[PDB]
Design an enzyme around this catalytic site. Structure first.
Site, short mmCIF file in Angstrom:
data_model
loop_
_atom_site.label_atom_id
_atom_site.label_comp_id
_atom_site.label_asym_id
_atom_site.label_seq_id
_atom_site.Cartn_x
_atom_site.Cartn_y
_atom_site.Cartn_z
N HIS A 157 -5.58 3.48 18.29
CA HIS A 157 -5.90 3.37 16.88
C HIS A 157 -5.68 1.94 16.36
O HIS A 157 -6.47 1.52 15.48
CB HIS A 157 -5.19 4.45 16.00
CG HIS A 157 -3.77 4.82 16.35
ND1 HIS A 157 -2.57 4.45 15.73
CD2 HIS A 157 -3.42 5.65 17.35
CE1 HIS A 157 -1.57 5.03 16.40
NE2 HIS A 157 -2.06 5.72 17.42
N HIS A 176 2.05 -3.79 13.50
CA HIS A 176 0.64 -3.58 13.80
C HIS A 176 -0.16 -3.93 12.56
O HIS A 176 0.41 -4.18 11.49
CB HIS A 176 0.38 -2.13 14.24
CG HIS A 176 0.72 -1.15 13.14
ND1 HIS A 176 1.96 -0.62 12.97
CD2 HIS A 176 -0.04 -0.68 12.10
CE1 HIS A 176 1.95 0.13 11.87
NE2 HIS A 176 0.75 0.11 11.30
N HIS A 221 -4.03 -3.08 10.26
CA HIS A 221 -5.23 -2.33 9.96
C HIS A 221 -6.27 -3.34 9.48
O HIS A 221 -5.90 -4.26 8.75
CB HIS A 221 -4.99 -1.27 8.86
CG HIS A 221 -3.84 -0.37 9.18
ND1 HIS A 221 -3.99 0.84 9.78
CD2 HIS A 221 -2.50 -0.54 9.04
CE1 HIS A 221 -2.79 1.39 9.97
NE2 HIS A 221 -1.87 0.58 9.54
N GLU A 227 -5.09 -1.11 3.63
CA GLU A 227 -4.78 0.27 3.27
C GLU A 227 -4.34 0.31 1.79
O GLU A 227 -4.99 0.96 0.98
CB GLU A 227 -3.69 0.79 4.24
CG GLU A 227 -4.22 0.86 5.64
CD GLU A 227 -3.53 1.88 6.49
OE1 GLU A 227 -2.27 1.87 6.53
OE2 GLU A 227 -4.23 2.69 7.11
N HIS A 245 1.68 -4.29 8.98
CA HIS A 245 2.81 -3.38 8.76
C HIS A 245 3.91 -3.72 9.75
O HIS A 245 3.73 -3.53 10.96
CB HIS A 245 2.37 -1.94 8.95
CG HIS A 245 1.46 -1.48 7.87
ND1 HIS A 245 0.65 -0.35 7.97
CD2 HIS A 245 1.28 -2.00 6.63
CE1 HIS A 245 0.00 -0.25 6.83
NE2 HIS A 245 0.36 -1.21 6.01
N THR A 264 0.92 6.05 7.37
CA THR A 264 -0.49 6.09 7.03
C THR A 264 -1.37 6.62 8.15
O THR A 264 -2.58 6.67 8.00
CB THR A 264 -1.01 4.75 6.53
OG1 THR A 264 -1.06 3.87 7.64
CG2 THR A 264 -0.19 4.20 5.38
ZN LIG Z 1 0.14 0.80 9.55
#
Ligand SMILES: [Zn+2]
Length: 257
Positions: A61, A91, A93, A103, A116, A195
């Site tokens: 992911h 990590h 997004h 996010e 994050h 999340t």
């Molecule tokens: Zn995250």
């Protein structure tokens, strides 16, 4: 059974993970006109001088840069937090386009990506126990915009070719996460969730106001990663963000005027 595709994305997650429709889900939109300055927040303390990175993993992911969390080596304290939270991984997004990827949003603005830095409360002994507690995790969220390069990100970018596909890892020692921070530590905070599934409501979110800048070439390299495993059909790892969730019975507090 969950992902970011056309048939398993965020709008489907509630079927396996019913807390997806819970009272304290993340991310949220941060309305800068209603978040209120809280003069009680204590100063925020990021102590990463002894951080020990170990490995980078494509988990299908995102990619996680993992740390040694068996001692207080890289810890977050202060701000809204009681006690000490140890860095376990960071990590990102990100989007397929520079106009999306974050996010959290700020007055509905989407950034190109969001970092994050995940920490767990040492009073619970290990990460797996911490995620079962309402105050188990503290996640430092940092927005990315496309502009100048971030020099402290380049070592991450350059290893991505070695972890293109799901399940690949690579040694990743001696990485300094201080190189990913903006100048200011001004922040917003609120209680929320992971999340990604299992979406547990265990997070004190600390979202920095000041974005970092990364170059177009750096983000383009994130977008060359794959969701799939090696020898499977190629699906670019892009748009791995959950959209904003209802704020419900929460207030977002600001550390700054
Ligand atoms: Zn995250």
């Amino acid at each position: 059974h969950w992902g970011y595709g056309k048939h398993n994305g965020p709008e489907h997650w509630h079927k396996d993970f019913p807390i997806a429709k819970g009272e304290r889900q993340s991310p949220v939109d941060i309305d800068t006109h209603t978040a209120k300055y809280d003069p009680s927040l204590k100063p925020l303390s990021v102590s990463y001088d002894q951080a020990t990175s170990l490995r980078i993993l494509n988990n299908g992911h995102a990619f996680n840069v993992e740390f040694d969390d068996s001692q207080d080596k890289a810890v977050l304290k202060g701000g809204p937090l009681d006690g000490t939270y140890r860095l376990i991984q960071f990590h990102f997004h990100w989007g397929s386009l520079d106009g999306q990827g974050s996010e959290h949003t700020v007055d509905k603005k989407k950034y190109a990506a969001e970092l994050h830095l995940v920490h767990w409360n040492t009073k619970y002994g290990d990460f797996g126990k911490a995620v079962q507690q309402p105050d188990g995790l503290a996640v430092l969220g940092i927005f990315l915009k496309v502009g100048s390069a971030k020099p402290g990100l380049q070592k991450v970018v350059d290893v991505l070719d070695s972890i293109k596909t799901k399940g690949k890892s690579a040694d990743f020692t001696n990485f300094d996460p201080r190189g990913l921070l903006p100048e200011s530590l001004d922040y917003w905070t609120y209680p929320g969730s992971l999340t990604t599934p299992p979406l547990l409501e265990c997070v004190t979110w600390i979202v920095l106001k000041e974005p970092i800048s990364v170059s177009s070439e750096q983000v383009l390299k994130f977008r060359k990663l794959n969701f799939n495993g090696e020898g499977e059909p190629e699906e670019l790892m892009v748009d791995n963000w959950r959209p904003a969730q209802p704020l419900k019975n929460r207030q977002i507090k600001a550390s700054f005027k």
